[PDB]
Ligand binder design. Structure first.
Ligand code: FAD
Ligand code: FAD
Ligand code: GDU
Ligand code: GDU
Lengths: 391, 391
């Protein structure tokens, strides 16, 4: 008679997805342990008192996916709005259409370019590097949008977001942005897209609503694992915290980036007239500004006040929560050591590793949930139900 | 034993809506008489042979409404895509964000304007006229977007579309375009919007699919009414053709505008990278160019060919099909005479008048359908079912 059938460290999208699936589809008790006073991780949102506008506390989250299984899954806990995310870029005191497209091109070069003419222009400016090569951020970016556009809209932004030389940064970072030769300025290229109709918190609460799931807020796993695991020794553990932290940075500290936010309620109805405005120039400390009233245009808010959030990027310290993995040459090598260690902990202590922090991966919400569904289907579910080893 | 319970002249959205409602909700036989070889009026679409791309034969039709009753009604015959219509404007060799918004403003004035700064700028340029006044197109346009924007994006376009002095044109024409101070470049401001998933023709066919509805193509009402009406003398008539034509232009010919189209299949994958590109300058004969592949981005078409359509505007003649009512001072006065005549025909011959052509009104698809549902509920249905007079 064990107390719990499963331990889940972290109540983020990965953890809650794991906890929900195991509790619902396998009929087993799951104890979720969250270090923070709230669930949902960075996806936790809150309604600003003066306006009632939902505020993405730890960075603006926009859900999008081309995976129908994920889409059908997340729809069990929330409805999604018709919202389609668009981003504008501030450069030299001018707002630019974004990302790569005819809008961006025509504005920056002072005249209209046909889809054929635009491809021709960029082909010239993407001379010294071809996409088939290009291992880093700088090489891949230039080979996609050309160098003049790279200088104005990538170099400065990347400098503030990473403070790391773009030749050391992964090429997968810049390919998150769609490269188009039309007037399509949708910031994502996924089939399904939208915002949680009743907020992220309500969404996250419905995933951990099952009575077979217990969430212990303000509880650190490393403090209470020596006491909990004996209570249920057969129960595996899903860890979604920082991978390097799990081993107390034994082989070294992985490269992370963290974010600081300035939330402000302005006495005006509209600050920038759009959801997210990227600041690509270096004469400004923050990377971008969010205006959350434009996240939900279907909702009607007061037109005498607005809520904005300036986003700042710096290196993650000891007491900081990690937001972005940097994955440089040294970081991936250090990651390789921890992957071997994690592979050992799985075989010796039934401890799994998943999530943005758990795998040192640049994971979006849908990619995290998909990764969780993968871990469930192929690892946890065969184990808890059919006794199949975790390896 | 009468042959038909109702006569409907014209198989446009108004006529088919009337025919469908009467046949389905009242269980009565409706004879629809269409002068054209096809149904649907200007909404009739066809698949271009080489590409399979749906082509709006008589002008690009984009459905949009804020009326849920209309929305729920039209959904009985077709599904709608997630499409949101956006228009760009060509001016001095540069593509501009459109309509009135921060995108348009910032591009045209060379720097970014905050929602507050933009309102300030336009307030200065909209000096000599206030919207509370402003009876014509020119006065209302300037009072909404200022004069400099009026010169560049309205004056030239209006000149080509109407060839009529903007001080003689209605103010309701320019207010069809949303005036915003954000980056929202959606060309419509309605709750519901989209394109028929399986084309307009399939949509139109499903409305006239009922076996109690008979459609006689290539049949002019004026030729066969003397023979048909005696066959069913109690059956009312819904006329949706040109109002002035019904009385053989007895008091004069109303002012109309007609359109000519040049459909072309280019050996390139993309001509302009967007659905509709407005040409506001006078150095070009056509008002705008449509590219129908961008109407349905969810559909995948061949990337070696594309279908475009240049739109030309001129005065409607005798043999021309009327597209736009002009409604000048003289036209509305002439319309007043025909309204009295139409009111007499209703009382003397049970003849109703509805639709874009039937009422000399600038009607969109949803406004036409809503107008048809209104005529049904308050006039036809009480008449055919409860014997209530048509007046
Ligand atoms: C600024 C920003 C914007 C983003 N925007 C988008 C977007 O628009 N669209 C999109 O799809 N994705 C977006 N993302 C990414 C997204 O937030 C992540 O994919 C998401 O958090 C996935 O959940 P995860 O659980 O894998 O990581 P996290 O949700 O951060 O989950 C980790 C949790 O583990 C807990 N934890 C860690 N260590 C311990 C411990 N020792 N004990 C107990 N608990 C612990 C933490 O408290 C945390 O709650 C954005 C991210 C950022 C930073
Ligand atoms: C270029 C263009 C673009 C447009 N785009 C949009 C858009 O994007 N969104 C939107 O909502 N609306 C749009 N509209 C408007 C829309 O097409 C009309 O609202 C629509 O046609 C409504 O139908 P209606 O029956 O009132 O007029 P029509 O559909 O033109 O119906 C009239 C019919 O009566 C028939 N007829 C006339 N006389 C006779 C006769 N004597 N005997 C027999 N039959 C006769 C004609 O053959 C015709 O088929 C657009 C219009 C144009 C011209
Ligand atoms: O104007 C830009 C935009 C992006 N980049 C480069 O592209 C990389 C990735 O760009 P992202 O937009 O993915 O940066 P974020 O991860 O911070 O974006 C986050 O915030 C966005 C909100 O607009 C999105 O929702 C996105 O999904 C979410 O991960 C960046 O590191 C940066 O190096 C630039 O250089 N300049
Ligand atoms: O760039 C512009 C656009 C509009 N106008 C003025 O605004 C009036 C109305 O503009 P519309 O866009 O409504 O012109 P249309 O009626 O031709 O538009 C038609 O084609 C459009 C397709 O993009 C829409 O779908 C629209 O609903 C449909 O009625 C015009 O007469 C014109 O005088 C301009 O001056 N300049």
């Amino acid at each position: 008679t064990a107390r719990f059938d499963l331990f889940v460290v972290g109540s983020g999208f990965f953890g809650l997805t794991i906890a929900e699936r195991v509790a619902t589809q396998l009929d087993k008790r799951v104890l979720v342990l969250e270090r923070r006073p709230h669930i949902g991780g960075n996806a936790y949102s809150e309604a600003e008192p003066q306006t009632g506008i939902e505020v993405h506390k730890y960075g603006a989250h926009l859900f999008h996916t081309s995976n129908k299984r994920v889409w059908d899954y997340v729809r069990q806990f929330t409805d999604f709005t018709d919202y389609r995310h668009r981003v504008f870029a501030m450069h030299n005191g001018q707002a630019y259409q974004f990302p790569m497209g005819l809008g961006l091109v025509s504005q920056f070069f002072g005249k209209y370019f046909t889809p054929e003419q635009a491809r021709q222009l960029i082909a010239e400016q993407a001379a010294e590097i071809d996409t088939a090569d290009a291992q880093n951020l700088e090489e891949k970016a230039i080979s996609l949008i050309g160098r003049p556009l790279y200088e104005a809209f990538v170099k400065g932004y990347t400098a503030k977001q990473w403070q790391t030389d773009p030749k050391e940064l992964p090429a997968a970072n810049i390919t998150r942005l769609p490269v188009r030769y039309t007037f399509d300025n949708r910031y994502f290229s996924d089939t399904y897209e939208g915002l949680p109709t009743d907020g992220y918190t309500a969404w996250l609460q419905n995933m951990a609503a099952d009575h077979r799931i217990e969430v212990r807020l303000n509880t650190d796993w490393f403090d209470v694992r020596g006491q909990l695991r004996p209570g249920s020794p057969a129960a595996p553990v899903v860890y979604t915290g920082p991978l390097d932290r799990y081993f107390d940075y034994a082989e070294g500290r992985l490269g992370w980036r963290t974010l600081d936010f300035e939330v402000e309620v302005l006495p005006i109805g509209d600050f920038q007239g759009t959801a997210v405005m990227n600041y690509n120039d270096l004469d400004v400390p923050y990377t971008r500004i969010h205006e959350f009233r434009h996240f939900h245009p279907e909702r009607d808010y007061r037109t005498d006040k607005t809520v904005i959030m300036r986003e700042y990027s710096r290196f993650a310290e000891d007491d900081d929560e990690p937001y972005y993995p940097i994955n440089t040459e040294a970081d991936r090598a250090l990651l390789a050591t921890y992957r071997a260690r994690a592979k050992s902990e799985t075989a010796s202590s039934k401890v799994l590793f998943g999530g943005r922090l758990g795998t040192y991966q640049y994971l979006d919400m849908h990619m995290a949930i998909a990764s969780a569904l993968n871990m469930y289907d192929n690892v946890l579910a065969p184990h808890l139900r059919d006794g199949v080893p975790l390896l």
